[PDB]
Structure 1
């Protein structure tokens, strides 16, 4: 089990670790988070008590180095940083643990929620969507725009999601206009799966990452990407059986995990209704349809 120590907590903040969150008071003697399961990506995220504007956070994988949080009173945020000195780090952690100034990643043993939300999410792939190659962790916040949102303003601070556009030359073969627009199988299977993602795992990883960025930072562009990637599969008549079964599981856990009170802003009426009721795959998402109908019958 791994640890993300905090130098301090000089400002009152709600801290998130994956799906868990903790209120920390101004100058409360908090020195970070222990017992973080090895083997998954994690995100540690923040919302200042004094300004709920700017949710922001760090995607990290504890196998890729020793990471700590330190408040920067100049830039006014909790920053992730890498400690290159292994023995200094182990020594810092051992002190804070002995003094029990660290919260425990509170994983229930029966609970596969985080695995199910991050099954295909790969830290080396996150670093290609969020480009800052001098760090092994990735910063995301509420206001970051996607490459696609910028096409229609600072490229350094962009989410480089794969551009999906149903009315693009990329999506539509010359001479197969009606066929490719009404059945997006070509676009899903040849352009996206064989061409760009190479396999269904990479496609699901970006889908899952887009969802998590939407849910944890309320990132609007991530929400658009998550819906687009769902809509491209549901609007394809020909999808491998394994992808359909996996999609149903992926979406089930996303709808299960969503705050009940955020359905109104995070869920797109048109996409869900189309995907569950009209699309080629309207019958292939049993789990997802059951949880959506029972949890958000208003949206439908």
Structure 2
């Protein structure tokens, strides 16, 4: 079990840790989060009480270093930092635990939700999408645009998701125009899987990361990326059986976790109706179709 201590909490803020969240009052004696499961990436995120504008946060993996949070009054946000002095860090954490000034990561034993949402997500791939090589953790916020959004402006602050574009020369073989547009298997299997992602685990990792940034930060370009990666699979007649089975599980847990009240903005009617009812894979996503129909029948 690992710990992310806080120097202090000078401004009133709602703090998220993965799918959990709690409110901290202005100058409340809060000194961090303990008992964080090792073996998974995590995200610690923030919404100030006075400016619900800009949700922001940090992806991290406690195996990669000792990280803490400290409010910066100049830049006006809670910043993640790495502590390189291991003994200073352990002494800080032990003091804060003794004084019981930390919240406990509140995982139910039965509960595999976070695993199921992050199964293929790896910190090393996160750090290639979010480029800031001097830190071991990655900042994301509501306003960051994607490389593809920038093509249609600050590149250092961009989400470098893999560009997917169904009407592109990358996606369409000369002479197979109709074939490749109507059946995207070539683009999925040769261009993206064999060529760019190398395997389906990396593809699923990026899909999962895009969903999580859409859900936790309302990041619009991340939602576009998530739906594009779903649509590319669903619009392919030829998909490995193991990928379809895994995709069904992935989407099931994403739809299960989505706040009911955010479905109007986070779910694209066209993609979902196409994927569940028109596409080649309309009959291949049984778990996802069943939860979508019972939880969001309006969308459909």
Given the two structures, how large is their TM-score scaled by the length of structure 1?
1.00
Partners of 2:137 and 2:168 in 1: how far apart? 33
Shift of 1:277: 0.2
Shift of 1:204: 0.1
Shift of 1:212: 0.1
Shift of 1:259: 0.2
SS state of the match for residue 180, structure 1? Answer: helix
Q: Summarize deviations over 1:236-265 as a string: whole Å, max 9, x none.
A: 000000000000000000000000000000
Shift of 1:24: 0.2
Q: Summarize deviations over 1:114-146 as a string: whole Å, max 9, x none.
A: 000000000000000000000000000000000
Q: Which residue of 2 aligns with 1:113?
A: 113
SS state of the match for residue 46, structure 1? Answer: strand
Shift of 1:34: 0.2
Q: Summarize deviations over 1:53-104 as a string: whole Å, max 9, x none.
A: 0000000000000000000000000000000000000000000000000000
RMSD (Å), alpha carbons? 0.2
Shift of 1:292: 0.2
Shift of 1:278: 0.1
SS state of the match for residue 26, structure 1? Answer: coil
Say how many residue pairs are matched: 300
Partners of 2:50 and 2:262 in 1: how far apart? 22
Partners of 2:197 and 2:107 in 1: how far apart? 32
SS state of the match for residue 270, structure 1? Answer: helix
Partners of 1:105 and 1:27 in 2: how far apart? 21
Partners of 2:139 and 2:122 in 1: how far apart? 15
Partners of 1:22 and 1:99 in 2: how far apart? 19
Q: Which residue of 2 aligns with 1:73?
A: 73
Partners of 1:49 and 1:299 in 2: how far apart? 32
Unaligned runs of 5+ in 2: none
Q: Which residue of 2 aligns with 1:271?
A: 271
Partners of 1:174 and 1:86 in 2: how far apart? 58
Partners of 2:223 and 2:36 in 1: how far apart? 27
Partners of 2:77 and 2:15 in 1: how far apart? 12
Alignment of 1:136-285 (within 5 A): 136-285=136-285
SS state of the match for residue 282, structure 1? Answer: coil
Shift of 1:182: 0.1
Partners of 2:247 and 2:59 in 1: how far apart? 23
SS state of the match for residue 192, structure 2? Answer: helix
Shift of 1:51: 0.2
SS state of the match for residue 206, structure 1? Answer: helix
Shift of 1:169: 0.2
Partners of 1:124 and 1:294 in 2: how far apart? 36
Partners of 1:264 and 1:142 in 2: how far apart? 17
Given the two structures, how large is their TM-score scaled by the length of structure 2?
1.00
Partners of 1:78 and 1:171 in 2: how far apart? 42
Partners of 1:236 and 1:24 in 2: how far apart? 47
Partners of 1:167 and 1:81 in 2: how far apart? 42
> Is it true that 1:45 corresponds to 2:45 in the alignment?
yes
Partners of 1:254 and 1:231 in 2: how far apart? 15
SS state of the match for residue 59, structure 1? Answer: strand
Q: Which residue of 2 aligns with 1:286?
A: 286
Shift of 1:165: 0.1
Partners of 2:83 and 2:8 in 1: how far apart? 16
Partners of 1:9 and 1:285 in 2: how far apart? 44
Shift of 1:157: 0.0
